[PDB]
């Protein structure tokens, strides 16, 4: 009842699953919606420059 801390590496496994799907979703899909080669950077240079 008392202990659900870092030592409990069955609770940490729960935290691992949670972090795992959270980082698969948000981090990966969002940071890969940013820039690719370099110049395009955001949008595709629709009017901003090109």
């Amino acid at each position: 009842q008392t202990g659900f801390t870092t030592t409990n590496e069955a609770f940490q496994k729960v935290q691992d699953a949670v972090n795992n799907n959270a980082q698969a979703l948000s981090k990966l899909a969002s940071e890969l919606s940013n820039t690719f080669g370099a110049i395009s950077a955001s949008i595709g240079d629709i009017i901003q420059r090109l």
Binding site: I39, I47, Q48, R49, L50
Partner: protein
């Protein structure tokens, strides 16, 4: 630009309309005396002196 007669107007990574309308941090406009004979030498990709 209307005061002169532009012989060449080539915009790279930018469009001729945008270079008149977009805003940015800083403009650098360098000028010199250049014959039209050596226009080919005046390019980013050339082996000319």
């Amino acid at each position: 630009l209307s005061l002169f007669s532009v012989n060449d107007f080539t915009c790279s990574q930018i469009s001729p309309a945008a270079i008149a309308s977009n805003c940015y941090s800083s403009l650098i406009l360098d000028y010199f005396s250049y014959p039209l004979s050596m226009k080919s030498d005046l390019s980013v990709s050339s082996a000319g002196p």
